[PDB]
């Protein structure tokens, strides 16, 4: 249910 907001942001 709990999912961390951890996108792959950057170059």
């Amino acid at each position, epitope marked *: 249910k709990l999912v*961390f*907001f*951890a*996108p792959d942001v950057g*170059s």
Partner: antibody
Amino acid sequence: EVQLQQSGPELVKPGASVKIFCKASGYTFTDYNMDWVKQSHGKRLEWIGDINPNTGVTIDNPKFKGKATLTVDESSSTVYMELRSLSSEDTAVYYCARLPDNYVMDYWGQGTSVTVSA
Amino acid sequence: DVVMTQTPLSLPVSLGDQASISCRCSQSLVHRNGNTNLHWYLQKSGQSPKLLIYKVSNRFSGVPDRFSGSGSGTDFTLKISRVEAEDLGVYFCSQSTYVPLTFGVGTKLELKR
């Protein structure tokens, strides 16, 4: 200076769709992501999704799966959001927001108002 | 969704007073990267929201030291030393630890008469 300029107000018929953009400037567009936030009557804020400019990969709010769709054209430093099958519940102001690697929405656009009416 | 509960909804103050806005969450906000991703935004009338404080206690660039934040786990507080006229508006707390990102209902900082 960081600038997030969004498209102008929209007037859409019930059941139709609309695509709003958000052009960025004042920084390297590729080192940051772009998020979208909804603000309705009562000024309640709802996060819609986050998109990466290099890959187009998105992290979406599941409550907007049948409503919003995020795309990006990094050549123009522009991020789009499509809102489809519009009803009165979609009449709101939609905001653009920059997301660095800290996962904090820091800079916001001026907002795009979408009004649903036949 | 992680629920953000703000107290109070309306905060009438006189200029110079101190103001405390509470934001309690349904669960801990400690991201797996160690950071507590709780932030405070200010939206003045007819404007866009603006980032005042991020990660509990970090002032964004340009924010006066008049503003300060504290808390951990599920209880957080935004404090203003001496409220100024430019500080009036709606204050939102928001978390970016879990998906989807959620916001508080908002706290309107109004002038007292």
